C-alpha cells in the first residue's frame, strides 16, 4: 500500500509524474478538486493548496501548482496562469510586445503529511514564442521556448520536455526527500 498520494485533477499532469515516479510502489494517486487562493506568488498559492487538499483526502498528500511569470507583464500571470490560458488561448502570444518576450516557467511541489508543509520549487528561464507551434503536451506548451533551445515544450517528446521543464528536476528532489 502507498504512503504518499499525489493529488491532481489534471490527467495530463498524471501521465507526466507517472512517467518518472511511476515505478515507485510507495506513491498513490488521488483526484480531489481544490480551490486556489487569489495571489500571484507561487509560494503562497502552493502552500495554501496543500492545506486545502489534506483537508479533503486526510492522507499524506502531494500537490502541484505552477507559474508563468512574464517580464512584459511585470510577472503576470504568476500563479494566475490557469485562467489566462482559458481566456487568452493563443492571443497570449499577441498581447506581449515583440522584442521583450522573456518569461520564467516556475513550478512547485508541496507535500503535507498532516503536520508540516514543505515546498520544492524549480524554475526554467525562457521566452514566449511569436506564435503557437507544436502538438504534444498540454496547456501553454505550444507558446513557451526554453533558453538555448529553439523548440517549444509542445514540439518535444515527454523525455525531452522533462529535460527542460521544472518537473524534471522536481522528480529527484521529491524522490530523495520522501524515499520513493
Amino acid at each position: 500500500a502507498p504512503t504518499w498520494f499525489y493529488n491532481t485533477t489534471n490527467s495530463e499532469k498524471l501521465r507526466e509524474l507517472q512517467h518518472v515516479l511511476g515505478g515507485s510502489a510507495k506513491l498513490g494517486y488521488l483526484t480531489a478538486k481544490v480551490t486556489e487562493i487569489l495571489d500571484v506568488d507561487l509560494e503562497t498559492v502552493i502552500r495554501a493548496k496543500a492545506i486545502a487538499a489534506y483537508r479533503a483526502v486526510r492522507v499524506p498528500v502531494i500537490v502541484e501548482h505552477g507559474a508563468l511569470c512574464i517580464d512584459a507583464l511585470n510577472g503576470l500571470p504568476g500563479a494566475l496562469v490557469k485562467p489566462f490560458w482559458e481566456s487568452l488561448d493563443t492571443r497570449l502570444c499577441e498581447v506581449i510586445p515583440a522584442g521583450q518576450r522573456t518569461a520564467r516557467a516556475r513550478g512547485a511541489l508541496c507535500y503535507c503529511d498532516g503536520r508540516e508543509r514543505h515546498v520544492l520549487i524549480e524554475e526554467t528561464e525562457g521566452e514566449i514564442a511569436p506564435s503557437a507551434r507544436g502538438t504534444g503536451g498540454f496547456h501553454w506548451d505550444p507558446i513557451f521556448i526554453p533558453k538555448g533551445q529553439t523548440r517549444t515544450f509542445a514540439e518535444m517528446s515527454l523525455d525531452e520536455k522533462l529535460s527542460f521543464s521544472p518537473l524534471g528536476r522536481l522528480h529527484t528532489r521529491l524522490r530523495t526527500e520522501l524515499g520513493l
Binding site: 500500500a1 502507498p2 498520494f5 498513490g28 494517486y29 488521488l30 486526510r58 492522507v59 498532516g114 503536520r115
Partner: protein, 277 residues
C-alpha cells in the same frame, strides 16, 4: 504505530474463533449503498429550513444543527424519519446490497452480536440475504421479546427507523444517552467487559461512544493490573483516513488502528472481512 491488513489478520482470527470478536458498524459501512453520511443529512436539513448548506454548517456541530431542525416547527422530526425511511430502506438500496462485497463478506461469518449506529435495515438485511436470520434489538420491548435460540443479535445502538422513538439524532437525545441507562447502553458496557470490538466504517465523533471507552479504563486503571496484563485485550479500528491526533488518543483506551488502502474503500474492507474467515 499502526497495524496493516496482513498484520491484523491473525489477531482477528484468534478472537473470532474464540467467539470474542464483535463488529461495530458506522455510517461509512452504508456508503456504497448511495446513502447520506452525517454531512449529506445536514445538507438536506438546510434545504428544508431555507439555509444554504455551507452557511448552515458553520453555526454548530452535527448534534446541534439537528436539534435546531427538530424545534423549528411541530412534527418536524417525525417527517425526517419518514423521509429517511423512504430513502435509506428503498428498493434500489436493497438491490445494491446483495451485490455489495462488504455486506456479503460480513454475512459469510458466523457472528453472534453486531452493533450498528446507522438507521437502516442493511446490516440485518445482509444476514437475511445469506440465508441466515437476525434479531434486531433496539428498544426495551425488543430485549424482552421472544427470539430464537442461536441467532445473531443486531443491536441498533442509535435506533431503528421502524421505531422512531429510539432514534438519537438531536443534541437532547445525545444528552439523554449520557446517563448510560438505555438498553443499548447497558448491553454495550457488558459486552465491552469481555470482548474485542472491530470498528468498521465508523469514526469516533460521538461523545457518548467515547465516554463508554473512557469509563472502561477507569475500571481498568483502578484494578491495578500490570503493564503486561492491562494491555492484553485490544479493540480494533479499521479506517482509511485516520489523522495524526486520533490514533494516539485511542491507544489510551486499548484501541488499535488498522490502516486500510484508501484508493478503493469498499474492496479494502471486504478483504479485511474475508481474512477473518
Amino acid at each position: 504505530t499502526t497495524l496493516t491488513l496482513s498484520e491484523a489478520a491473525p489477531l482477528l482470527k484468534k478472537e473470532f474463533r474464540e467467539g470474542r470478536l464483535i463488529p461495530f458498524l458506522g455510517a461509512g459501512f452504508s456508503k456504497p449503498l448511495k446513502l447520506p453520511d452525517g454531512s449529506q443529512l445536514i445538507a438536506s436539513l438546510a434545504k428544508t429550513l431555507g439555509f444554504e448548506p455551507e452557511l448552515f454548517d458553520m453555526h454548530g456541530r452535527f448534534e446541534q444543527l439537528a436539534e435546531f431542525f427538530a424545534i423549528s416547527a411541530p412534527n418536524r422530526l417525525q417527517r425526517l424519519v419518514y423521509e429517511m425511511s423512504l430513502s435509506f430502506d428503498s428498493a434500489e438500496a436493497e438491490a445494491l446490497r446483495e451485490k455489495s462485497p462488504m455486506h456479503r463478506a460480513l454475512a459469510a461469518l458466523d457472528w453472534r452480536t453486531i452493533y450498528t449506529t446507522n438507521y437502516d435495515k442493511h446490516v440485518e438485511g445482509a444476514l437475511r440475504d445469506a440465508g441466515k436470520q437476525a434479531a434486531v434489538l433496539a428498544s426495551f420491548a425488543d430485549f424482552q421479546g421472544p427470539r430464537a435460540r442461536d441467532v445473531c443479535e443486531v443491536i441498533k445502538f442509535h435506533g431503528t427507523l421502524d421505531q422512531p422513538d429510539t432514534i438519537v439524532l438531536t443534541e437532547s437525545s445525545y444528552f439523554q444517552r449520557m446517563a448510560l441507562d438505555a438498553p443499548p447502553d447497558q448491553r454495550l458496557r457488558a459486552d465491552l467487559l469481555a470482548n474485542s470490538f472491530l470498528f468498521i466504517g465508523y469514526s469516533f465523533s460521538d461523545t457518548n461512544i467515547r465516554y463508554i471507552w473512557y469509563r472502561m479504563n477507569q475500571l481498568r486503571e483502578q484494578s491495578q493490573l500490570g503493564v503486561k496484563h492491562s494491555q492484553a485485550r485490544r479493540c480494533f479500528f479499521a479506517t482509511h483516513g485516520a489523522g495524526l491526533v486520533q490514533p494516539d488518543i485511542l491507544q489510551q483506551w486499548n484501541i488499535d488502528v488498522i490502516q486500510l488502502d484508501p484508493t478503493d474503500k469498499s474492496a479494502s474492507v471486504a478483504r479485511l472481512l474475508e481474512s477473518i474467515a
